[PDB]
């Protein structure tokens, strides 16, 4: 009966480990684009401003 | 001997909701700035072109 309660935990283990990495890694997939566009933005800043 | 591992993992999962959530809370802090870079491009485009 104590064993069964941990059967709930294994999913709580299974989900979180999935819920943890696959988003934090996902965030880096989002993270790079920020500076990617921002650096484009910075030249996009002075472009008119130099023109 | 069960109370050895069952306690820790239960506690180990006790972090999980704090583990996901603040990281989950981060994801909002992703999206807000996303448009700011995005929304400026057209103004950063047009101004180079309306000039």
Partner residue facing A27 (CB), from B30, B37, B51: B30
Percent helix, strand and coil across chain A, each to the nearest 5:
95, 0, 5
State the resolution, in angstroms. 5.8
Residue A38: which residues within 8 A CB-CB, separation 6 or more?
B37
Query: Whose CA is closest to B13, among A40, A25, A13, A33?
Result: A13
The end-to-end CA distance of chain A, in Å, is: 74
**Among chain A residues, CA nearest to B38:** A37
Query: Which of A16, A26, A36, A50 to substitute to test the interface with B, most B CBs within 10 Å?
Result: A16
Structure method: cryo-EM
């Amino acid at each position: 009966l104590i064993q069964a309660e941990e059967r709930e935990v294994s999913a709580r283990l299974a989900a979180a480990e999935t819920a943890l990495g696959e988003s934090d890694a996902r965030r880096q997939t989002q993270d790079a684009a920020l500076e990617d566009n921002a650096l484009e933005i910075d030249r996009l800043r002075n472009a008119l401003l130099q023109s």
